[PDB]
Structures are given as structure tokens and as C-alpha cells.
Amino acid sequence: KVGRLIYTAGGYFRQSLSYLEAYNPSNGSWLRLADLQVPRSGLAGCVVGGLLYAVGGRNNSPDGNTDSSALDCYNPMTNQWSPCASMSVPRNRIGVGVIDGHIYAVGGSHGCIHHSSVERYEPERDEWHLVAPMLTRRIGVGVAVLNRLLYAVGGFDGTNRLNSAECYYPERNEWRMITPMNTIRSGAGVCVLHNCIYAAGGYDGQDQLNSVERYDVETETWTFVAPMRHHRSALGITVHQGKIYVLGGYDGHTFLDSVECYDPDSDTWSEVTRMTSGRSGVGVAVTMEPC
Ligand SMILES: O=C(O)CCc1ccc2ccc(OCC(=O)NC3CCCCCC3)cc2c1
Ligand SMILES: [Cl-]
């Protein structure tokens, strides 16, 4: 379990960013690592087999806005990024989950298109294939995996921000609605901790949120837990050693540098560190420290 860092990739502040930075919860230190080949915001990060993957997003720059179909792989042993097979379609404001070594890319936008499509990456073959689409088009969707089931939570369908959520059952290649959240949330941080799917922050169509709710997959209920110190939309999120970490986002005024940590045993949030600069729309995941 030792030696793991929280990696943050990409993001947005005035334009899309290429930063790869890694935080060590054990000593508070931050490292700046190899830049992404292409700056991207609205991407997702995940880890398979010790490799960090950056999936999708958009490059916003003064010279254009290009939605990304890219899958890129970072190896901490070499501090190098390598291109992987690209997705069938660009996906900005994507959600990603991993089941049994396979990456699922969910939703996202391509220009004015709001995707319901979903595709699955096989690292051993370096191939993507489409799977069943969701029941709802969703961008800014939160995705997490619990007990080898894939959840897609909230988002924006092109007309309305959503409180709905749905679950993908891989052995039936089928999506089913689950109980909707109590709050409409687009751009929430969604993760899994113990037996619950957590949805932190987001935008409800009127304000950035500090509220946090969790779905118990056995009881099928959503329950609020302690709110974050900061309202945040387009935040990064991950779980590490039994605690949720939220990174950055937008509070309606500032692009935040704050990182908060949720302890489920005390039901409290604490501010633990600051990123090197405020930013939103980052991809976050946890893997071994680099060499
Ligand atoms: O339209 C809605 O309902 C809300 C839209 C939404 C939802 C999720 C996002 C996730 C990442 C993401 O990255 C790029 C990103 O930070 N952009 C913007 C968000 C922060 C403030 C405005 C300027 C930058 C964007 C997202 C946008
Ligand atoms: Cl861990």
C-alpha cells in the first residue's frame, strides 16, 4: 500500500492545461512530472496495471477548441507519456470507470453533440469497442465502479442538468435507472468508498454546490453527508486509504487550489493541501510514485 501518490492531470485556468503533478499524502510534497503531449481539460484519469491513463477532454486555447478522442498512458517508471488507441469519438466532460482491467469511457460532448454512447478499452489488445449506450445522454457525468457494476451519475443531457443516475450490468450489456439523487448535479465529483457511490459538489443549474450525497447500493437510497468547506463544480476526485480527496474546481468566483479530504468515520472534511495553482476540470487517479 505504501508509495502511492495522487496524480492530477490537465485542467483549466484561462485555457486548457498540460500539467501532470503528483501529491504525496504521507509528507505533503508535490512533484511536477512530464507534461501531457496535448493540453486538455474535461478529461478523466484512471489507473490500470500501474499505468496512468488520461482519457478524452478538450483543448481550449486562444487558437481553438478541439474535443479529444485521445487515450494516453503515463508510466511512472519512465516519466513518459505514450499514445494509446483513440476512442471512436471525441468526448469532452467525460466520465471513466475501470472494471476488471478494462476502461469504460462514458458520455461526454463533441461540439453540440451530447453522447449517450459508451465504449470499453482492452489494454492487452490496445483496442476500443462500443458497448450498450446509456438510457440518457450525459456530459459532465460522474462515473464510478462498485462491485464490478458501473454507475453514471448526473450530468447534462443538452437541455437539462440531471439528478438521474443509471447502472451498467456488464454481463447483460444493459443499463438500468437507479434511484435519482436528491440534487441536480452536473460536473460533480463521483467516486466509491466502502459500499457507497459518493457525489460531491457540481452545479445544479443555479449555483456551485458544497453538498455531498452517497448512494448505498444495497438500500438504493441517497443520503447527504457533511458538506465540503467549498462550493465546487468541475472538481477532481479520488479515493486513497479510505478517504475521499477533492481537488480544485470552480466556486463561482475563483478557480480553487484547495484540496479537501473526507473521513467517513468522523463524517468530516478537512483541508489538507493546495495545488500549485487553482484549476478546474482535472483528471485524477492514484498510482505508484515515479522514478
Ligand atoms: O453545463 C453544466 O451543466 C456544467 C458544465 C460542466 C460540467 C462538468 C465539467 C467537467 C470538466 C470541465 O472541464 C473544463 C472546465 O473546467 N470548464 C469550465 C468549468 C469552471 C468554470 C467556467 C470555466 C471553465 C467542465 C465541465 C463543465
Ligand atoms: Cl489506496
Pocket test for ligand 1, best of 18, 41, 204 (most atoms within 8 A of CB): 41
Backbone torsions φ then ψ of 155, nearest 5 degrees: 105, -160
Ligand 1 atom nearest 12 alpha carbon = 16
Number of domains in the chain: 1
Q: Where on the phi/psi map is residue 69: left (φ > 0), alpha (ψ -120 to 50), or beta?
A: alpha
- Quote the cell numbers at residue 206: 443555479
Nearest ligand atom owner, CA of 285: 2
DSSP E strands, 132-281: 142-146, 149-153, 165-169, 174-178, 189-193, 196-200, 212-216, 221-225, 236-240, 243-247, 258-263, 268-274
Judged on CB neighbours under 10 Å (0-12, 13-18, 19+), 14 is exposed
**Residues contacting residue 170 through CB under 8 Å, at least 6 positions apart:** 99, 131, 148, 149, 150
Ligand 1 centroid, distance to 234 Cα (angstroms): 5
Pocket test for ligand 1, best of 159, 183, 233 (most atoms within 8 A of CB): 233
Closest CA to 225 of 258, 183, 271: 183
* Site residues for ligand 1, CB cut-off 6 Å: 12, 41-42, 93, 140, 156, 161, 186-187, 203, 234, 250, 280-281
Judged on CB neighbours under 10 Å (0-12, 13-18, 19+), 15 is middle
Give the number of other CB atoms < 10 A from CB of residue 229. Answer: 13
**Which DSSP state fits 182?**
S
One-letter amino acid identity for 264? P
According to DSSP, the residues that pair with 52 across neighbouring strands are: 47, 74
Q: What share of the chain is helix, strand, coil (3-state, %, to 5)?
A: 0, 50, 45
- Sequence-distant contacts of 251-260: CB under 8 A, at least 24 apart: 251/208, 252/207, 252/208, 254/278, 255/12, 255/13, 255/279, 255/280, 256/230, 256/232, 256/280, 258/229, 258/230, 259/23, 260/228, 260/229, 260/230
CA distances from 238 to 24, 42, 134, 144, 174 (A): 13, 15, 23, 10, 26
Reported resolution in A?
1.6
Q: Rounded CA gap, 85 and 4, in Å?
A: 27
Q: Rounded CA gap, 238 and 236, in Å?
A: 7
CA distances from 18 to 11, 26, 35, 105 (A): 7, 25, 5, 21
Judged on CB neighbours under 10 Å (0-12, 13-18, 19+), 288 is middle
Q: Rounded CA gap, 30 and 7, in Å?
A: 10
3-state SS record for 57-94: CEEEECCEEEECCCEEEEECCCCEEEECCCCCCCCECC
> Which domain covers residue 157, as residue numbers?
3-291
One-letter amino acid identity for 153? V
Residue 57 near residue 77 (C-beta atoms within 8 A): no
* Total residues found in the chain within this entry: 291
Name the method of structure determination: X-ray
CATH at 216: 2.120.10.80
According to DSSP, the residues that pair with 9 across neighbouring strands are: 20, 283
**Residues contacting residue 152 through CB under 8 Å, at least 6 positions apart:** 95, 106, 107, 134, 138, 141, 142, 143, 165, 166, 167, 168, 175
**Residues contacting residue 63 through CB under 8 Å, at least 6 positions apart:** none
4-9 and 20-23: which strand pairing?
antiparallel
Residues with C-beta atoms within 5 A of ion ligand 2 = 240
Closest CA to 15 of 47, 50, 62, 54: 62
Pocket test for ligand 1, best of 93, 109, 185, 203 (most atoms within 8 A of CB): 93
Closest CA to 92 of 141, 150, 143, 43: 43
